[PDB]
Structure formats: C-alpha cells, structure tokens
Amino acid sequence: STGSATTTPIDSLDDAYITPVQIGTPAQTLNLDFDTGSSDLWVFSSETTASEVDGQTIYTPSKSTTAKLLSGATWSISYGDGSSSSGDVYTDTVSVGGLTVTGQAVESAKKVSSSFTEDSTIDGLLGLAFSTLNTVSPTQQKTFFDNAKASLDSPVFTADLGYHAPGTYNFGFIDTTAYTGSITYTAVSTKQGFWEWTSTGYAVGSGTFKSTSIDGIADTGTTLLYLPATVVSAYWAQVSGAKSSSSVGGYVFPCSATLPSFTFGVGSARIVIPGDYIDFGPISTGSSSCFGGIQSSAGIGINIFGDVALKAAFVVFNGATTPTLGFASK
C-alpha cells in the first residue's frame, strides 16, 4: 500500500504545516501537524476542556462506530517550546492520503496549553519519530508510520515541504519526479528516539564550505533551523545590522536586508537554503526589525533541522531495519 497527502502552510510565514487526516467511521477529517520530532498522534476532541478550544475541529469518538476506549491508558506530553497537552486514548481507524491503519491509538486531549488553543488551524499532531518516545501509559503505543510499515510497498515516508506553498507527505514510495539529481543517504541514530543524523558542514552565502560534524534531528514540527552558536554567529555576521536580541528571543535583522543563503552538508552533497527562506518577517506588526530563521540551539540541548532546512530538500525517512535519512535537491 501507499498514501499521499498534501501538506499546507498554516500562514504566510510557513510557521507550521497541516495535513488532512481521516479518523473514525464515518470519517472525521482533522488537520494535523505532522511532527517527525515526536511520537504521539493526539487530537482536539469532544473531551477537550471547552475554554481551551478556539476554532479547532474536534474528534468525537462517540460518533465513530469503530472507536474503542483504550481502557486505563493516559498520555501527557511536553514539547521543547514549553507547550503541552494530555488526556486519554481511543483506538480507531486512521487514514492519511488513502493509506489506512486500523487500531491506531488516537490520543484524545482533555487539556492543551495556550499555544495550542491559540492556533485555530491545528487540530492536533501526528507524530512520526520513533515509537520509543510515545507517551501513552501504562502501555506505550505505536506511531501511524510504525503501524502502517508492514503494509507499505517500501518502509519509508517522504517530506516535501513547500516554501510559501503546499507540499506533500508520501508513505510507502519515493516519487522520483519530486526531486532533482540523486538522493544522498546518511546514517541515523535512534538512541534518543529521533531522526538524528550528522551533517558534514556548512557554508554562508557564496563562502567556502566549512567541514565540521553537526549532530541534529530532522524535525518537521519545528519551524526554524537551530544550530550551534558558532555557526549561527557566522551566518548573521554577514547581514548588516543583525544582532541577537534577548528581549525578542533570538537573532533579528533589518527588514531592509537581503539575506544570504545557507548551505548544509549531507555526506558529500550540499543542500542550499535560499536567503528568502530565512526571513520570518517583522517581529511585531509594522516593525522594521525582522525575525531570523536560523537561531542558536544553545540551551535547547540539540541541533534541530526544522522546516527552514527541510523545505529546501526532498527528504526520505527510511524506516527499514537500519533506518537512514535521504536528502535531494528539488
């Protein structure tokens, strides 16, 4: 089997991407944030505290003939941005782009933090990291990908995110029309439960490539590119007037600037992030200070190849017995 679904930016900045997902019988379609940095499929629901719902579409298990309470199971998750959610668990039929999993754990939110309430366009998350990070207790549950894997034509999914445009998540096949050149594969460590890999270095603009190992995670659920302070300083040093602002919470730059590109290494291959991808616009409405798309990972504890990086590539998440990651230009 295979599946193919379009993923769409939630706003003009590509702050996140949503993908329609069918849950239950008859289908209830919710728009979920596919997150390769976590491993819970959770949704706003008829159980979510009413004051914490503001425009989201909810899953109502009582209206699904295939929903079953997973008795005694609870979940609770905290994300790196300080947001969180928790609740109980149903199993139900879940379909993505024509690919169906029966018996998928659907984590129903009883509580969500303010960041989620305020994002009316995101009806929940679909985790695509390794199932070892799943938070359901006392019986840990599998991700949608893990459940689908044995049925897939090939044990892979691909992320093809657009810059200010829709893109595609495919399951079970590699669309050879969706990228240019060849795909370069690189080793993955699953020790922390993430799609963790080591970039071979970077360049700023038309500058020389610096060969240096940068361990990080491929995380479709993180908006920006978070890299070591040394790398990030070298980038922003090439932008007149750019500075790190503790009041704003990161690097800002004059909105009048033209940003240089940023290149990262994948083995001997190179992925170029155009300068425009690094512009996240005014810090507040009408401001002439703009927020940067490359930020320091210092104090996160991990480098994160988020959407800024991933959307410059066609990315293969290879979940074969030895997992790997593939990157191609597009």
Side-chain angles (χ1 to χ4, degrees), residues 1-62 64-67 69-109 112-141 143-148 150-190 192-242 244-330:
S1 61
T2 64
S4 182
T6 298
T7 191
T8 302
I10 65 165
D11 64 22
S12 65
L13 300 181
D14 298 347
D15 281 314
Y17 297 79
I18 51 172
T19 309
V21 177
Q22 283 70 49
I23 310 175
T25 308
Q28 299 181 37
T29 298
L30 274 66
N31 297 326
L32 305 188
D33 187 345
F34 282 24
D35 180 16
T36 64
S38 70
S39 306
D40 287 52
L41 192 175
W42 74 259
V43 297
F44 279 77
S45 74
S46 57
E47 301 179 330
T48 311
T49 300
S51 66
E52 295 179 349
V53 183
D54 188 8
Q56 295 80 10
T57 295
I58 62 164
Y59 170 58
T60 303
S62 64
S64 173
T65 60
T66 43
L69 180 72
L70 185 64
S71 183
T74 58
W75 63 279
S76 182
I77 194 161
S78 302
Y79 297 100
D81 67 347
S83 67
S84 64
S85 53
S86 64
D88 57 15
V89 187
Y90 292 83
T91 56
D92 209 339
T93 301
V94 173
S95 302
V96 176
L99 170 65
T100 300
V101 168
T102 56
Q104 174 64 46
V106 177
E107 301 173 36
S108 168
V112 304
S113 64
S114 58
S115 166
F116 288 114
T117 299
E118 292 160 2
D119 277 11
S120 63
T121 66
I122 294 174
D123 302 325
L125 268 62
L126 189 149
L128 292 167
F130 293 88
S131 292
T132 54
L133 294 181
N134 176 266
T135 77
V136 177
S137 180
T139 308
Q140 189 174 56
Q141 301 294 304
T143 70
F144 175 82
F145 179 51
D146 218 330
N147 283 323
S151 303
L152 293 178
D153 291 357
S154 181
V156 305
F157 68 91
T158 64
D160 181 10
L161 303 180
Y163 168 68
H164 297 171
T168 306
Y169 282 103
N170 290 330
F171 292 83
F173 72 107
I174 287 160
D175 181 357
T176 59
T177 73
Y179 60 88
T180 59
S182 54
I183 306 178
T184 298
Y185 290 87
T186 196
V188 164
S189 174
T190 63
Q192 291 191 95
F194 299 120
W195 293 92
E196 186 175 359
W197 64 291
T198 303
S199 172
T200 50
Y202 71 99
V204 175
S206 58
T208 61
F209 187 85
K210 177 68 169 181
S211 290
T212 186
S213 294
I214 306 170
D215 292 341
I217 67 169
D219 185 359
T220 58
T222 290
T223 313
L224 306 185
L225 175 52
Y226 294 89
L227 291 173
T230 48
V231 177
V232 175
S233 181
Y235 178 80
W236 288 109
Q238 297 304 311
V239 179
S240 298
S244 184
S245 169
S246 58
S247 64
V248 174
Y251 281 89
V252 296
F253 67 93
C255 294
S256 60
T258 300
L259 297 177
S261 62
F262 184 89
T263 301
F264 63 95
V266 183
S268 59
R270 306 289 180 255
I271 299 294
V272 181
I273 306 171
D276 290 346
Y277 290 25
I278 299 160
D279 177 19
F280 280 75
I283 59 170
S284 298
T285 305
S287 179
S288 72
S289 183
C290 274
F291 197 74
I294 296 179
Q295 296 295 343
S296 179
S297 64
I300 294 178
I302 198 159
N303 300 306
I304 307 174
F305 293 87
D307 300 333
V308 163
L310 303 180
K311 76 181 77 170
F314 176 87
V315 189
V316 181
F317 294 79
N318 171 28
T321 306
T322 298
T324 65
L325 272 173
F327 292 82
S329 293
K330 67 186 184 189

